[PDB]
Symmetry: C2
Subunit: 74 residues, 2 copies
């Protein structure tokens, strides 16, 4: 649905995770990383998680801090 | 959570995960399981994924098949 605007969003995002894959990255941190990556703001307001788990190999879970956290497959 | 409305929902779903902790499980499988197990319909309707992700030790993933697969954090 977002791929309407950003046909590369899957790949931009994989790039962000790939970047953060050691500790995995939060959503807010993903949004920020994406601004900084593309020069553009992360397009999704809510149900970011539902969207992210659409991208193959993207994984999610709550950290030690109980924060939701995304990464790719080990 | 929605645990507010549904008294045993937590332990039910965790029971299903625990049973399935080997290969992980989809959402529809989780529902039909919950039915088979409680003889009742799965209570939740909208926003199930955030729910499951609220459960301690759970991990969602997107298979290369496109499937959304829930499981329990692997023990190292």
């Amino acid at each position: 649905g977002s791929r309407e605007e950003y046909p590369d969003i899957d790949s931009e995002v994989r790039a962000i995770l790939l970047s953060h894959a050691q500790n995995g990255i939060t959503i807010s941190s993903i949004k920020s990383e994406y601004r900084k990556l593309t020069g553009n703001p992360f397009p999704l307001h809510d149900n970011v998680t539902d969207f992210l788990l659409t991208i193959p190999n993207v994984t999610a879970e709550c950290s030690e801090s109980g924060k939701r956290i995304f990464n790719l497959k080990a």
